[PDB]
Design a protein around this ligand. Structure first.
Ligand code: SAM
Ligand code: ARS
Ligand code: ARS
Length: 465
């Protein structure tokens, strides 16, 4: 049994160290992982009660270490799972939550823990603070007298990140942009488990006794769905942390502000609106897309204002004007090839993508004028500015290119928008399956809206004198 585990581990490391069809490669590492997982005992450490039985002990511990515990409670919400609910009215500008640095789990708490000796010797742990935090969480989970036990015992036992999807759930993402990041996440997590199973030279860790794949998947998913950035002890730069109490807050586009109080050395949340008793207390996780939310947080946000789909574009080395185009882009601080995004909102493109498309479609004479800088206007500075077109001709060409490109990308999809919406009527679809389908539907709705915006712009510029 232990010799067999290490044998399958070595094969997993090799299988995940070769680059790449993508789906075929994914099912291979998936059948390999599900085999190693079958031979293991799930999570090495489990707790006697359900997570909700442990919330009073999390509150007591946070309270004893100086955190704000009054005016809220933990409630199981239908749409977001567990979260915080106000027990009284909260007024705008009220400093509602504060969590002292002592409660946090950081790379700094990791280095000072039983994990320090292995952290000091391992190069992978040194370059990836999130993986180091994942291991710090694992080591402490398995230490019964750990200071962080009231926090670890209230953490979820599973997540809705793609690492937890069944093959049939991921299948729904075939022929989408998002599926590429899902494969990469699966291939990197498996590679990481393999490397670290072999490495696990500090044997004083409770991971020497038991370190399953389910342990690693739980640790990295706990970190990616909950990690927040905090400043360092001196305030020089940003670092990652797991913040107890605070990380019970779900996401909404709400009237709250979060920050770090350097002087009092604590994580702070200020209400920017009055909240009524019995209302859920949320925080803003950031202007993340639904792809970033599904893949790194395990949820799809329906009311996402910031939804977008990734798009790769580059100037062709076979274009006669490649060198001039590349130079104008470099002077504007834009690469010759990169991953851009198409936004659901009007305008679908950023100042950086507008700048790129204008250069991509410039004539030789326009390129020369930009490189000479003999305009009364700094044309490099206004390159991504909608108010300063290079020419109506350039605008017509770039909006034509975008319309055509988005139309082409749309055809690469296996299902229609109506088919996605019909599928979504199945009340028995799993949470994970609904997330994959909404994501697939979302990509198409963004591309369809981008075709329409590009046509409106093409028409507008073809109407100019
Ligand atoms: C930082 S924790 C928030 C507390 C989490 N609900 C729990 O029970 O521990 C983040 C997790 O909450 C969920 N979540 C947060 N906001 C959400 C939302 N608006 N809709 C659905 N799920 C949400 C996802 O499972 C996410 O991975
Ligand atoms: As904070
Ligand atoms: As708050």
């Amino acid at each position: 049994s232990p010799k067999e585990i290490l044998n399958l581990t070595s094969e997993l490391l090799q299988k995940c160290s070769s680059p790449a069809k993508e789906w075929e490669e994914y099912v291979q590492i998936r059948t390999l992982v599900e085999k190693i997982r079958k031979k293991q005992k799930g999570l090495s450490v489990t707790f006697d009660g359900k997570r909700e039985d442990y919330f009073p002990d999390l509150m007591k511990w946070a309270s004893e270490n100086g955190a704000s515990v009054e005016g809220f409670e933990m409630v199981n919400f239908k749409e977001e799972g567990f979260g915080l609910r106000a027990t009284r009215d909260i007024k705008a500008e009220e400093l509602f939550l504060w969590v002292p640095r002592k409660l946090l789990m950081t790379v700094e708490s990791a280095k000072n823990s039983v994990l320090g000796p292995l952290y000091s010797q391992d190069r992978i742990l040194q370059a990836m603070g999130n993986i180091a935090l994942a291991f710090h969480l694992l080591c402490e989970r398995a230490s019964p007298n750990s200071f962080w036990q009231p926090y670890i015992q209230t953490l979820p036992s599973e997540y809705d990140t793609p690492l937890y999807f069944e093959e049939d759930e991921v299948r729904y993402l075939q022929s989408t942009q998002a599926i590429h990041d899902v494969f990469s996440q699966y291939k990197n997590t498996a590679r990481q488990y393999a490397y670290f199973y072999k490495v696990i030279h500090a044997n004083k860790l409770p991971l020497k006794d038991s370190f399953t794949y389910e342990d690693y998947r739980w640790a990295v998913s706990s970190v990616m769905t909950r990690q927040n950035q905090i400043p360092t002890e001196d305030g020089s730069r940003v670092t990652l942390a797991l913040i107890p109490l605070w990380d019970m807050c779900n996401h909404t586009n709400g009237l709250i502000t979060t920050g770090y109080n350097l002087e009092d050395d604590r994580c702070e949340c200020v209400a920017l609106q009055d909240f009524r008793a019995g209302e859920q207390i949320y925080i803003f996780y950031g202007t993340r897309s639904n792809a970033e939310f599904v893949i790194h947080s395990g949820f799809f946000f329906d009311n996402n204002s910031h939804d977008r789909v990734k798009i790769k574009l580059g100037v062709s080395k076979s274009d006669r004007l490649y060198a001039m185009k590349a130079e104008v882009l470099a002077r504007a601080g834009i690469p010759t090839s990169s991953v851009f995004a198409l936004h659901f909102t009007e305008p679908p493109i950023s100042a950086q993508l507008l700048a790129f498309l204008r250069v991509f479609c410039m004539t030789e004479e326009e390129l020369k004028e930009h490189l000479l800088g003999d305009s009364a206007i700094d044309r490099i500075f206004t390159l991504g500015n909608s108010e300063f077109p290079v020419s109506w001709d350039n605008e017509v060409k770039l909006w034509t290119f975008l319309e055509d490109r988005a139309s082409l990308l749309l055809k690469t999809y296996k299902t229609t928008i109506e088919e996605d919406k019909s599928v979504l009527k199945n009340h028995d679809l799993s949470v994970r399956a609904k997330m994959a389908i909404k994501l697939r539907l979302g990509e198409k709705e963004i591309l369809e809206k981008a075709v329409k915006s590009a046509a409106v712009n093409r028409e507008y510029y073809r109407q100019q004198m």
